[PDB]
Swiss-Prot record:
Result for mutant: Y124H: In FA11D; transfected cells contain reduced amount of mutant protein and display decreased secretion
Cysteine pairs bridged by disulfides in the record: C29-C45, C127-C194, C158-C173, C184-C212
Organism for this UniProt entry: Homo sapiens
Residues shown, of full length: 388 to 624 of 625
Lineage: Eukaryota, Metazoa, Chordata, Craniata, Vertebrata
Active site residues of this protein: H44 (charge relay system), D93 (charge relay system), S188 (charge relay system)
Residue stretches making up the Peptidase S1 domain: 1-236
Name this protein carries in UniProt: Coagulation factor XIa light chain
Amino acid sequence: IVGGTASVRGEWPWQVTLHTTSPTQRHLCGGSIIGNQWILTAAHCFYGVESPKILRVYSGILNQAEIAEDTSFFGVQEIIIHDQYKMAESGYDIALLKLETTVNYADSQRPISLPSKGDRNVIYTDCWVTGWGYRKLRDKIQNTLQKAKIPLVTNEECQKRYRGHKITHKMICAGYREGGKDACKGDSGGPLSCKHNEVWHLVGITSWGEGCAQRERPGVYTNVVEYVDWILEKTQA
Ligand SMILES: *[C@](=O)([C]([C][C][C][N][C]([N])[N])[N]C(=O)[C]([N]C(=O)[C]([C][C][C][N]C([N])=O)[N]C(=O)[N][C]([C])C1=[C][C]=C(Br)[C]=[C]1)[C]([C])[C])C1=N[C]=[C]S1
């Protein structure tokens, strides 16, 4: 996260940090708890991942330092990538992680509500992006979960900022015309939580962008509401 600040512990209870143990353990991507056994994240986050066995999901984390060899985690039973996904910039950058065990909800870890179809006309004026991504291009994985408030921009406006790209209705962007605050490397898969009427909603999934926090380069996210049907279909046994 660029231009953000340290989060309060438990402030984003749905945020998880997805680690890979290969070659040695490290943070790979962000993710969101949406069900007792389900994490919603980005599909492109599994590039080079042949098996779910090397994945570890940690919930209720603030500082990466909290994660040690003796720290409990959730194993991943299955990685479900949207069948139309090819690459982040083309859309469909969404994936579901079915955990091997159920998450016991608590103040430190609980699910975020998915947006409803009857909410595409809602004016989210309180949206935040979080994760342990780069604070800058040449940076590394930050220890403390960062957060940054960022306004959503219309798709027409976003398309203007990305000429060589095709910004579809299945994407949603957020950023400051002048830049300064944005997601960055490592925040991928993270949630773009928006508070609408006292209730937090998972509006987007951190996907891509030209660089990080550059002026006139909004962050691009997966427009979650466009996938509620897909999510329902893939989560039902
Ligand atoms: C994810 O954490 C990041 C999240 C990026 C969110 N960005 C903002 N600003 N909100 N995702 C990526 O790194 C993805 N790639 C890119 O975002 C960009 C796309 C550029 C397209 N530009 C134009 N104008 O066409 N690519 C990119 O940065 N590529 C270089 C080679 C790169 C260098 C170092 C690292 Br780390 C990643 C990419 C990925 C490629 C889909 C992460 N997902 C994986 C690692 S971080």
